[PDB]
DNA sequence: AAACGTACGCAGTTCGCG
DNA sequence: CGCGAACTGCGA
């Protein structure tokens, strides 16, 4: 099993390191024969001798062309003749590529910015994470001493916990009487003890939750202050911080640092992504959270540290269990993309596509297009195109609703209509498909590059969807459901890649052709179900719609829906397939992107509602949730109205706990870059002026008090709320929080109650 | 050096124009 | 003051 690859430099020459696990043993395979290269398209063959003499410099090293070789390749399927330029070191290429491209006889250069380690795995046909080798894993977490206004890692680390199959333990330098706690005397001794534990256990995988941003950076800073060599790497190196765009990540040489946060963030849909919320969503069990202030109080007074040590232990325990569950999913994606799990688990879906395209292009001797330069990138950013079809929803509380959607609308269109940059407006093409409205022609004579790849990806998803249905175990079934959804989004991300400005295989004509065909197909299914089966489509968005037969009972709606599915699937061509998603006994559709339905098990699913979003207080979400249940489950409009009257009366009489009035909103930039100052920005600016560290990602938790001025003038951070001096704004939480969250819902059901609120 | 990206859509807060 | 634009943030 190949775990990872990188390169080092020995005496000026690059040495590829292949990190492997074979027969239960970690091994490093070295390759000193791999030469970096890129391609040059020349105006005339005779200029190659002048191109060979181009030189450059980098860090005191004179860069020259080592060897050139003429090769026959394809570019978007058409034969091309380019020169392969070899170099000694991969760092030579960035230093010299601009001067080579600037030569008057050089038309363009290609494949000049592919990282040396990824170039090696592609050109050698090597796939990570293959085989039956069992990987050893170890999760860890830290607890720190925090005080408001201090620099990052100004206070010491208090606890370091870890967990594997042998259990979970905590290392700390204060006496805590728990059997899983190991006590040392100083923070330095605890760090060095943790370093020892990792050395003796020698795990292949280090699991964290947000270790890319907090744990490793905190450990790093503390190790510099204490003079500790944090030699976590299998080659004796320290963890290395890396940067991708605006995100940071930490690698440990010879191992796989598996940070679960970017994995869970795009695998599960949750309102918040705390470790406690993630563990509860996956395993169905709650996890207690102990906050930084209680940790500091327990450590500094010495009272109540067992609770802190239990929280620290459970942090490591649930991180190991989560990592164990999600490793197989990310291992498969690593095999599918063809890049190490460290990169695949963190990289954007654009690179998940492009890294695979680069590998398949190499297998087919297809020259890769370049990432755009500054002018082309800006031009792609400005241009846009039409997207999915969204229908204005029908008002009212409807009954006996079916939701029908396409299995994989955009990948199906790409394959069926052969939508690819190498098939667009192809000369001398015999048979082609013309996209509606946008009019682009896609050749059908030969399968396009990208269409020829999506079919296998879709089948991999159907394989997981089959194993999911055949698995009775609820946890294993849920994990497979997470897995098949990741593959579905990855495949559909091929359409978005077509419109992504940084894409090598960018194709705006391809992107708007896919959406145009998508709009045509959903409008076709909508027209057919209404005309031929007497259905009424209530709401539709991009690849699915809600429909019913007005006045019919549940059995008739169900029976006629399957009949229509047989009818429409016979008509729909290629890979397009409409599916029976589910039946719902009641539902309403507030606006576009806003709806709520309930199945025959009384389970309420919603879309785009306030119960999920940030910026809404608990009293508003709770009241909305109770109104949803009263309308959907009980069908009782008078009960829903009664609930609103009771909640607004409780607010007017100050009987609602102020904890239910906290509003959480995230700061997304430096406070200087805000052009308008709203409630959460005004609070953040007031906090920062007092020494509180405000950074992008900081969540502001405020409450609106009775006072004067704008809402921002009345809002204060909830951590400073004192019920002895502060009285909250009851009129605000009624008129701006509770009422907007229920009034649109009740109106969408056809009930515009004048005096919903208590008194006024 | 490497780059978290597709269109469509709602809605709260703020504040000058007419 | 009604209205709407600008800003802001998030949600197939
Ligand atoms: O390499 C040839 C081009 C040189 N060049 C520039 C290079 C910038 C490199 C960025 C390095 C970097 N890393 C390491 C990359 C892997 O993450 C890193 C890791 C972690 C945190 C931060 C960082 C950074 C910040 C920056 C610059 C210097 C930009 C430049 C300017 C003009 C011409 C050539 C180059
Ligand atoms: Mg790497
Ligand atoms: Mg664009
Ligand atoms: Mg069909
Ligand atoms: Mg006027």
Q: What is the 3-state secondary structure (H, E, C) of A36-54?
A: CEEEEEECCHHHHHHHHCC
Nearest nucleotide by C1' from A243 CA? B2
3-class secondary-structure state, position A100? helix
Phi (first) and psi of residue A319, to 5 degrees? -70, -40
Whole-angstrom CA distances from A514 to A71, A274, A390, A464 are: 35, 37, 16, 26
Which are the contacts of A178, defined by CB distance < 8 A and separation ≥ 6? A170, A306, A309, A310, A313
In the 3-class helix/strand/coil scheme, how is A344-361 assigned residue by residue?
A: HCCCCHHHHHHHHHHHHH
Structure obtained using: X-ray
DSSP string across A602-670: --EEEES-TTTSSS--HHHHHHHHHHHHHHHTS--HHHHHHHHHHHHHHHHTT-S-GGGG-EEEE--S-
CB A349 within 8 A of CB A338: no
For residue A562, the CA-to-ligand 4 centroid distance in Å is: 14
Domain at A137-326, CATH homologous superfamily? Ribonuclease H-like superfamily/Ribonuclease H (3.30.420.10)
Residue with tokens 């020829």: A452
Output the CA angle A642-A644-A645, nearest 5 degrees.
Answer: 65
Burial bucket for residue A329 (CB in 10 Å: 0-12, 13-18, 19+): buried
Instruction: Please state, in angstroms and rounded to a whole number, the distance separating the CA atoms of residues A573 and A617.
Output: 48
Measure the CA–CA gap between A619 and A728, rounded to whole angstroms: 13
Residues whose CB falls within 8 Å of the CB of residue A461, separated by 6 or more in sequence, listed in order:
A408, A484, A487, A488, A491
Would you list the domain boundaries of chain A?
2-123, 137-326, 371-598, 614-748
Atom of ligand 1 nearest to the CA of A243: 17
Nearest to A210 by CA among A148, A274, A271: A274
**Residue whose entry in the numeric block shows the structure tokens 């308008």:** A676
DSSP string of A685-723? HHHHHTT----TTPEEEEEEBS-SSSHHHHEEEGGG--T
Provide the phi-psi class of A702: left if phi over 0, else alpha when psi is between -120 and 50, else beta. Answer: beta
How many angstroms separate the CA atoms of A214 and A152, rounded? Answer: 10
Token pair, residue A466, equals 């089959």
Which CATH superfamily groups domain A371-598? B family DNA polymerase, palm domain (3.90.1600.10)
Nearest residue to A625 (alpha-carbon basis) of A745, A748, A730: A745
- On whether the CB atoms of residues A574 and A415 are closer than 8 A, the answer is yes
Taking the alpha carbons of A318, A319, A324, A330 in that order, is the dihedral positive or negative? positive
Determine the distance between A296 (CA) and B5 (C1') in angstroms: 41
Instruction: State how far the Cα of A621 lies from the Cα of A628, in Å rounded to an integer.
Output: 10
Going by CA atoms, what residue is nearest to atom 20 of ligand 1?
A242
Cβ(A76)–Cβ(A84) below 8 Å: no
> What CATH number matches the domain at A2-123, 1.25.40.10, 1.10.10.10, 3.40.50.720, 3.30.342.10?
3.30.342.10
How are beta strands A37-42 and A78-86 bridged, if at all?
antiparallel
Ranges assigned E (strand) in A32-113: 37-42, 56-58, 61-63, 67-75, 78-86, 106-110
- Angle (CA) A667 A286 A614, round 5°: 25
Phi first, then psi: give them for residue A621, nearest 5 degrees: -65, -45
Is A241:A257 a contact under the CB 8 Å cutoff?
no
CA distances from A245 to A217, A248, A345, A376, A672 (A): 18, 8, 15, 19, 22
| Strand C contact at CB of residue A470, distance < 7 A | no
Tokens, residue A221: 């800073």
Neighbours of A114 (CB within 10 A): 21
User: Which pairs count as long-range contacts for A605-614, CB under 8 Å and 24+ apart, including other chains?
Assistant: A610/A741, A612/A271, A613/A271, A614/A271, A614/A664, A614/A665, A614/A666
User: Distance from first CA to last CA of chain A, Å, rounded?
Assistant: 70
∠ CA A544-A548-A550, rounded to 5°: 155
* Residue A315 DSSP SS3: helix
> A666 CA to B18 C1', in Å?
36
Closest nt to residue A377, judged CA to C1': B3
Question: Superfamily assignment of A614-748 in CATH?
Answer: B family DNA polymerase, thumb domain (1.10.132.60)
Å separating the CA of residue A295 from the C1' of nucleotide C6: 43
CA distance A597 to A517: 28
Nearby residues of A94 by Cβ (< 8 Å), 6 or more positions away: A58, A112, A113
């Amino acid at each position: 099993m190949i775990l990872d690859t990188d390169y080092i430099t020995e005496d000026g020459k690059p040495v590829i390191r292949i990190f492997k696990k074979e027969n239960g043993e970690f091994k490093i395979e070295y390759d000193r024969t791999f030469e970096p290269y890129f391609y040059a398209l020349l105006k005339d063959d005779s200029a190659i001798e002048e191109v060979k003499k181009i030189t450059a410099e980098r860090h005191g090293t004179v860069v020259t062309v080592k060897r050139v070789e003429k090769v026959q390749k394809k570019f978007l399927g058409r034969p091309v003749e380019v020169w392969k330029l070899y170099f000694t070191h991969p760092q030579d290429v960035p230093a010299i590529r601009d001067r080579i491209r600037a030569h008057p006889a050089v038309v363009d250069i290609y494949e000049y910015d592919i990282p040396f380690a990824k170039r090696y795995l592609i050109d050698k046909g090597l796939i990570p994470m293959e085989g039956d080798e069992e990987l050893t894993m170890l999760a860890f977490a830290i607890a720190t001493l925090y005080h408001e206004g201090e620099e990052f890692a100004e206070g010491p680390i208090l606890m370091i916990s870890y967990a594997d199959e042998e259990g979970a333990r905590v290392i700390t330098w204060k006496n805590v009487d728990l059997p899983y706690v190991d006590v040392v005397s100083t923070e330095r001794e605890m760090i060095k003890r943790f370093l020892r534990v990792v050395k003796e256990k020698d795990p292949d995988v280090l699991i964290t939750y947000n270790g890319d941003n907090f744990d490793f950076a905190y450990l790093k800073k503390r190790c510099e202050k204490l003079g500790i060599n944090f030699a976590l790497g299998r080659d004796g190196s320290e963890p290395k911080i890396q940067r991708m765009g605006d995100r940071f990540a930490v690698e440990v040489k010879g191992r796989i640092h598996f940070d679960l946060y970017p994995v869970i963030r795009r695998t599960i849909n949750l309102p918040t992504y705390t470790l406690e919320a993630v563990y509860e969503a996956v395993f169905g069990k709650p996890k207690e959270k102990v906050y930084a202030e209680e940790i500091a109080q327990a450590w500094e007074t010495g009272e109540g540290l067992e609770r802190v040590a239990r929280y620290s232990m459970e942090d490591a325990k649930v991180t190991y269990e989560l990592g164990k569950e999600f490793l197989p999913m990310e291992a498969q994606l690593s095999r599918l993309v063809g890049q190490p799990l460290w990169d695949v688990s963190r990289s954007s879906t654009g690179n998940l596509v492009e890294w695979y395209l680069l590998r398949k292009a190499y297998e087919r001797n297809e020259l890769a297009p370049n990432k755009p330069d500054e002018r082309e990138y800006e031009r792609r950013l400005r241009e846009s195109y039409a997207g999915g079809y969204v229908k204005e929803p029908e008002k009212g509380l409807w009954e006996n609703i079916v939701y029908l959607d396409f299995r994989s609308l955009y990948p199906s269109i790409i394959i069926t209509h052969n939508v690819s940059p190498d098939t667009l407006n192809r000369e001398g093409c015999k048979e082609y498909d013309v996209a509606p409205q946008v009019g682009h022609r896609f050749c059908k004579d030969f399968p396009g590059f990208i269409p020829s790849l999506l079919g296998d990806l879709l089948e991999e998803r159907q394989k997981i969807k089959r194993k999911m249905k055949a698995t009775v175990d609820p946890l294993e079934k849920k994990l497979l459901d997470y897995r098949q959804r990741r593959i579905k989004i990855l495949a559909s991300s091929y359409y978005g890649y077509y419109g992504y400005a940084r894409a090598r295989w960018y194709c705006k004509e391809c992107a708007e052709s896919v959406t145009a065909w998508g709009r045509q197909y959903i409008e076709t299914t909508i027209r057919e179900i209404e005309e031929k089966f007497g259905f009424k489509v209530l709401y539709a968005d991009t690849d699915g719609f809600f429909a019913t037969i007005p006045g019919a009972d549940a059995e008739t709606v169900k029976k006629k829906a399957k009949e229509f599915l047989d009818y429409i699937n016979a008509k729909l061509p290629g890979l397009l397939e409409l599916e029976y998603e589910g039946f719902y006994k009641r539902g309403f559709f507030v606006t576009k992107k806003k709806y709520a339905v309930i199945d025959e098990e009384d389970k309420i699913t919603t879309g785009g509602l306030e119960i999920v979003r940030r910026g809404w207080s608990e009293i508003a979400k709770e009241t909305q949730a109770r109104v949803l249940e009263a309308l959907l489950k009980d069908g009782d409009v008078e009960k829903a109205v009664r609930i609103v009257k009771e909640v607004t009366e409780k607010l007017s009489k100050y009987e609602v706990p102020p904890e239910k009035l906290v509003i959480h909103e995230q700061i997304t930039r430096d406070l200087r870059d805000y052009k308008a100052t709203g409630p959460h920005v005004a609070v953040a600016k007031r906090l920062a002026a007092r020494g509180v560290k405000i950074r992008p990602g900081t969540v502001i938790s405020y409450i609106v008090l009775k006072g004067s001025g704008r809402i921002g003038d009345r809002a204060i951070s909830f951590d400073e709320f004192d019920p002895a001096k502060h009285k909250y704004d009851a009129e605000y939480y009624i008129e701006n929080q509770v009422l907007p969250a229920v009034e649109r819902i009740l109106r969408a059901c056809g009930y515009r109650k004048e005096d919903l609120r208590y008194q006024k």
